[PDB]
Design a protein around this ligand. Structure first.
Ligand SMILES: CCCc1cc(C2=N[C@@H](C(=O)NO)CO2)cc(OC)c1OC
Ligand SMILES: [Zn+2]
Length: 300
C-alpha cells in the first residue's frame, strides 16, 4: 500500500516574517490519517485554522495567503506547502505564533530539513492521488499553464524575465517529480526581488523581513548576492518550486504532466480550480498490493 504520511514528532523552528520582519515561531504537529494539511495561527484567541484548499487561496505581491470565512489570513504558505508536497505529507498541523510563516532562506530546503528532523510516519491508510484524465488548459494573455494525462509526475516550466541576468539557456526546466528530485533539484531554489522594489516597500514600512539572507536580490543589471546563484537556472527552478506548492492546495499529490509558460501563483491556482471544477477531468486513485485484495475478489 502507498500510505498517507505525517510526522513522527512535533518540531519547532524560528525565523523572520517577510512582511513584519519580526521573529516568528513555527511548530509542526503529527496528525491522524484523512485530516489533511491544516495551517493554524496561535497568536489569535481562539486560534484560527486554515485548511489547505484551492478555493481558500489569496495571492498578493509578496506572498500567497489562506483566508478564512471572515477575511482573516495566514501568509507566506507557498514554500512550506511545496516542501509538504515534495515529501508527500498528507496530514499535518502547521502552527505559527504570528500572521505569517517565516521566510527562512527564501527556498523550501530549510522546511525539508525541518520535516526530516521531525521524521516521516506512514499511516495505515491508502494515500489518495488526483489523477489527470483530460487535458486542461488556462491562459492569461501570452501566459498559460496546462495539465495533461501522464502515468507519473512531471513538471515543465518556462519563464521570460528578459532580465540581463537570465540567459535564454536558463529560461526552461523540465523534470520528473519525486521526493528525491524535489530535494536535490528544486528545494534549495530561492525566491527573488529587485533591490528597488525592496527598498521602496521598506520605505513604506513593508516587506521589512526582506534581506540578502532570504532571497536572490538583483538590480537592473546583475545578481547582487555575494555567492551568486545556487543554480545557473535558479530562477526557473524556483517558479517550479512555487507551482508544486500551488498544486498541493488540493491536499493530494497529482498524477499527470504539468506544463507552464510564464505562469505564476494566480495562474497556477486558476489551473488547479479549473481541473477540480471539471469532474470528468480527474479522479481519485489508490495503490495496494495483490495480497491486500479482498479474499473474496480473488474470484475467477
Ligand atoms: C528580499 C526579497 C523580497 C521579495 C520577496 C518576494 C517573495 N515572494 C514570495 C515567493 O517566492 N512566492 O512564491 C516570497 O517572497 C517577492 C518580492 O518581489 C516580487 C520581493 O521583493 C520585494
Ligand atoms: Zn516562491
Amino acid at each position: 500500500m502507498i500510505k498517507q504520511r505525517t510526522l513522527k514528532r512535533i518540531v519547532q523552528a524560528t525565523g523572520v516574517g517577510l512582511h513584519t520582519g519580526k521573529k516568528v515561531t513555527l511548530t509542526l504537529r503529527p496528525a491522524p490519517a484523512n485530516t489533511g494539511v491544516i495551517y493554524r495561527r496561535t497568536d489569535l484567541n481562539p486560534p484560527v485554522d486554515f485548511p489547505a484548499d484551492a478555493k481558500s487561496v489569496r495571492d498578493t505581491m509578496l506572498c500567497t495567503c489562506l483566508v478564512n470565512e471572515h477575511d482573516v489570513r495566514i501568509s507566506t504558505v507557498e514554500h512550506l506547502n511545496a516542501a509538504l508536497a515534495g515529501l508527500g505529507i498528507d496530514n499535518i498541523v502547521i502552527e505559527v505564533n504570528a500572521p505569517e510563516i517565516p521566510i527562512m532562506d527564501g527556498s523550501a530546503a530549510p522546511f525539508v530539513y525541518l520535516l526530516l528532523d521531525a521524521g516521516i510516519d506512514e499511516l495505515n491508510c491508502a494515500k489518495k492521488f488526483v489523477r489527470i484524465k483530460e487535458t486542461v488548459r488556462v491562459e492569461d494573455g501570452d501566459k498559460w499553464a496546462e495539465f495533461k494525462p501522464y502515468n507519473g509526475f512531471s513538471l515543465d516550466f518556462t519563464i521570460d524575465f528578459n532580465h540581463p541576468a537570465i540567459d535564454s539557456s536558463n529560461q526552461r526546466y523540465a523534470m520528473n517529480f519525486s521526493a528525491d528530485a524535489f530535494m536535490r533539484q528544486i528545494s534549495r531554489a530561492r525566491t527573488f526581488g529587485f533591490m528597488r522594489d525592496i527598498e521602496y516597500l521598506q520605505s513604506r514600512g513593508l516587506c521589512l523581513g526582506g534581506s540578502f539572507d532570504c532571497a536572490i536580490v538583483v538590480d537592473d543589471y546583475r545578481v547582487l548576492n555575494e555567492d551568486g546563484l545556487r543554480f545557473e537556472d535558479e530562477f526557473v527552478r524556483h517558479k517550479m518550486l512555487d507551482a508544486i506548492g500551488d498544486l498541493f492546495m488540493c491536499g493530494h499529490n497529482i498524477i499527470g504532466a504539468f506544463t507552464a509558460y510564464k505562469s505564476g501563483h494566480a495562474l497556477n491556482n486558476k489551473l488547479l480550480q479549473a481541473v477540480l471544477a471539471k469532474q470528468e477531468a480527474w479522479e481519485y486513485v489508490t495503490f495496494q498490493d495483490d495480497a491486500e485484495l479482498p479474499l473474496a475478489f480473488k474470484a475467477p
